[PDB]
Design a protein around this ligand. Structure first.
Ligand code: KCC
Ligand code: CL
Length: 115
């Protein structure tokens, strides 16, 4: 069901190394809907290559546009399993401190703060 269940640890490590080789300026991001989520739709894919200069505030705007949300729909994003302390941090800095041992950066979205 989840990305980690679909691909082996060895397969996930190797896909991050291929992104380092072929898209060296991109952050490898896994974005998944909270398994309780009723209101928000699913994304068209799971694995995203994010330009390393964008901050978390801009990534939230990108994901709202990808999901085709309207102005009043609530959206909450966890990174590495927890709330973001700040949305102003460049994703290169977020990646270095919150990356998974496989080298992906894991995000989960819900319509409620209570995941
Ligand atoms: C951490 N060790 C490695 C080993 N081989 C690699 C090949 C391509 C890109 C990154 C790589 N990193
Ligand atoms: Cl690149």
């Amino acid at each position: 069901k989840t990305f980690k269940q679909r691909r082996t640890f060895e397969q996930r490590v190797e896909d991050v190394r291929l992104i380092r080789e072929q898209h060296p300026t991109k952050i490898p991001v896994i974005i998944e809907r909270y398994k309780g989520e009723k209101q928000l739709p699913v994304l068209d894919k799971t694995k995203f290559l994010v330009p390393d200069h964008v901050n978390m505030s801009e990534l939230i705007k990108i994901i709202r546009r990808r999901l085709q949300l309207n102005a009043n729909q609530a959206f909450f994003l966890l990174v590495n399993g927890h709330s973001m302390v700040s949305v102003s941090t460049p994703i290169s800095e977020v990646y270095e401190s919150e990356k998974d041992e496989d080298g992906f950066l894991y995000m989960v979205y819900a319509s409620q703060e209570t995941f």
